[PDB]
Amino acid sequence: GSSGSSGEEDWVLPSEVEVLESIYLDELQVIKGNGRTSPWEIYITLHPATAEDQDSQYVCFTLVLQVPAEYPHEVPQISIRNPRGLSDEQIHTILQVLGHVAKAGLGTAMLYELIEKGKEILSGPSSG
């Protein structure tokens, strides 16, 4: 039997987004949720800017981020929808890599970082 709570409700998640939007006005979408014990959702479109000469230049994936309530305390579950162009193996490699980055940026704004990787990963070395 334990209850009782009071104080100011703060949240960096919604504090950073305001800054991100300015940059990713449309590039990135954010579904506000009046920060009511509800996990925020963020979408974005990324493409590999490396495949120029090689074949199958067609490849894109929608990065979906679900920021829970704990956040930043908790890392946003990184998911991928409509994973086209990329293979099961690749897709996973994108979930694992990002997965960590999330924790590496705990305690403060991370959404920014996460997104960054979303690009780097897609891109790779030069081979022909």
Swiss-Prot record:
Domain RWD stretches: 15-122
Post-translational modification: Ubiquitinated; autoubiquitinated.
Compartment(s): Cytoplasm
Transmembrane domains' residue ranges: none
Subunit note: Interacts with UBE2D2, and may also interact with UBE2E1 and UBE2E3. Interacts with RELA/p65.
Function: E3 ubiquitin-protein ligase that plays a key role in the RNF14-RNF25 translation quality control pathway, a pathway that takes place when a ribosome has stalled during translation, and which promotes ubiquitination and degradation of translation factors on stalled ribosomes. Catalyzes ubiquitination of RPS27A in response to ribosome collisions, promoting activation of RNF14. RNF25 catalyzes ubiquitination of other ribosomal proteins on stalled ribosomes, such as RPL0, RPL1, RPL12, RPS13 and RPS17. Also involved in ubiquitination and degradation of stalled ETF1/eRF1.
Family (UniProt): Belongs to the RNF25 family.
Protein name in UniProt: E3 ubiquitin-protein ligase RNF25
Gene that specifies this protein: RNF25
